[PDB]
């Protein structure tokens, strides 16, 4: 088959030596790589920029004529990634080379047969500060109709976290928005944990770290990200080949999702970044 789906909760991706390169989530769809050798035990695959090997034990073959395969599609204004059958995210502006309503396929969301995307937020150095002020960040809640968020009116805390830890506050807002449903998930409300800190796939709620209050949750999560990712040379969102997404999340499109939120916020606030 050309496409395979991940069966267990997570599955590893390996190099030719059998060394672990990353891990990907249940239901993820990987492409068979016909330029490398597969055998009975391991398939040469590509996923979210990463070319490696997966155990056949962890995979189920798909039929693209009846099973969902992730794809990209333009509405004539934005290009969307269908990451699941009923969920899309905007990744880029429409390019004249895109046919509206045509499904496109890409192993990295950057290289397509007929055009190339820039996803600048996906590769932006997260140690560079946002050009948004605390007051501008606070405006996003009204502009994106975000109701009942624990993060409302916390722009000043995001900017303090940026000042102190040298981590982009637009990224911190977008990461908390995506990971905790704008500070409305049960982990957010119970644990003041807006960033999925130690929310492991096997037991996400139980494993998630606890913080004392909303401000200590924003500052403590920022500290944790700085010490565990930025200071260890993971300085951009990325994908399964490089960046924070290699280790931070099993979801192969975690980085693309956060970059999409950054893109949406930046457009609403006037394009300063």
Ligand X SMILES: CC(=O)N[C@@H]1[C@@H](O)[C@H](O[C@@H]2O[C@H](CO)[C@@H](O[C@@H]3O[C@H](CO)[C@@H](O[C@@H]4O[C@H](CO)[C@@H](O[C@@H]5O[C@H](CO)[C@@H](O)[C@H](O)[C@H]5NC(C)=O)[C@H](O[C@H](C)C(=O)O)[C@H]4NC(C)=O)[C@H](O)[C@H]3NC(C)=O)[C@H](O[C@H](C)C(=O)O)[C@H]2NC(C)=O)[C@@H](CO)O[C@H]1O
Report the interface residues with ligand X, using CB under 6 A.
10, 23, 25, 83, 87, 89, 178-181, 185, 187, 196, 198-201, 204, 228, 247-251, 254, 257
Residue 179 binds which one of ligand X, Ca ion, none, with CB within 5 to 8 A depending on kind?
ligand X
Residue 10 binds which one of ligand X, Ca ion, none, with CB within 5 to 8 A depending on kind?
ligand X
Nearest to residue 248, comparing CAs of 87, 107, 48, 102?
Answer: 48
Which residues are CB-neighbours of 24 under 8 A, at least 6 positions away? 6, 10, 11, 13, 30, 47, 48, 240, 250, 251, 252
Report the b/e string of 168-178 with b at 16+ CB within 10 A. bbbbbbbbbbb
CB 22 within 8 A of CB 15: no
Helices (H), the chain: 120-123, 134-143, 155-165, 169-180, 186-191, 204-207, 214-228, 245-248, 254-268
Tell me if residue 111 falls in helix, strand or coil. strand
For Ca ion, the closer CB: 21 or 129? 21
Give the C-alpha separation, 173 to 155, whole Å: 8
For Ca ion, the closer CB: 21 or 146? 21
Q: Does 39 bind Ca ion (CB under 5 A)?
A: no
Distance of closest approach, residue 42 Cβ to ligand X, in angstroms? 17
For ligand X, the closer CB: 169 or 261? 261
Distance of closest approach, residue 240 Cβ to Ca ion, in angstroms? 16
Which residues are CB-neighbours of 120 under 8 A, at least 6 positions away? none
Distance of closest approach, residue 235 Cβ to Ca ion, in angstroms? 22
Residue nearest to Ca ion (CB): 17
Distance of closest approach, residue 178 Cβ to ligand X, in angstroms? 6
For ligand X, the closer CB: 133 or 184? 184
How many CA atoms within 13 Å lie on the side-chain side of 101?
Answer: 0
Q: Does 20 bind Ca ion (CB under 5 A)?
A: no
Distance of closest approach, residue 14 Cβ to ligand X, in angstroms? 12
CB 122 within 8 A of CB 259: yes
Distance of closest approach, residue 150 Cβ to ligand X, in angstroms? 13
Distance of closest approach, residue 199 Cβ to ligand X, in angstroms? 3
**Binding residues with Ca ion: total (CB under 5 A):** 3
Rounded to 5 degrees, φ, ψ at 68 are: -65, 130
Which residue in the set 2, 7, 8, 15 belongs to the binding site for Ca ion (CB under 5 A)?
Answer: 15
Residue 15 binds which one of Ca ion, ligand X, none, with CB within 5 to 8 A depending on kind?
Ca ion
Residue 196 binds which one of ligand X, Ca ion, none, with CB within 5 to 8 A depending on kind?
ligand X
* Chain positions contacting Ca ion, by CB under 5 A: 15, 17, 19
């Amino acid at each position: 088959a050309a496409y395979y789906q991940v069966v267990p909760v997570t599955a590893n991706v390996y190099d030719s030596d059998g060394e672990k390169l990353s891990y990907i989530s249940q239901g993820s769809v990987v492409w068979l790589d016909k330029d490398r050798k597969s055998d009975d035990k391991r398939l040469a695959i590509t996923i979210s920029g990463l070319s490696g090997y997966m155990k056949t034990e962890d995979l189920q073959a798909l039929d693209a004529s009846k099973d969902f395969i992730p794809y990209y599609e333009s509405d004539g204004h934005r290009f969307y990634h269908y990451v699941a059958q009923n969920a899309s995210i905007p990744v880029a502006s429409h390019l004249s080379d895109m046919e509206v309503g045509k499904k496109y396929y890409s192993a990295d969301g950057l290289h397509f047969d007929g055009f190339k995307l820039e996803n600048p937020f996906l590769f932006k150095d997260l140690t560079e500060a946002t050009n948004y002020s605390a007051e501008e960040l606070d405006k996003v809640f009204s502009l994106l109709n975000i109701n009942n968020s624990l993060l409302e009116n916390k722009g000043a805390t995001f900017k303090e976290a940026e000042e102190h830890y040298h981590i982009n506050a637009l990224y911190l807002l977008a990461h908390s928005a995506l990971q905790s449903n704008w500070g409305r998930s049960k982990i957010a409300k119970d644990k003041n944990n807006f960033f999925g800190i130690t929310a492991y796939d096997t037991t996400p709620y139980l494993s998630a770290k606890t913080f004392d209050d909303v401000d200590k949750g924003i500052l403590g999560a920022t500290k944790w990200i700085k010490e565990n990712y930025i200071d260890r040379g993971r300085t951009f969102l990325g994908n399964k080949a490089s960046g924070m997404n290699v280790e931070y999340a099993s979801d192969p499109y975690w980085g693309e999702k956060i970059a999409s939120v950054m893109m949406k916020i930046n457009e609403k606030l006037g394009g300063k970044d």
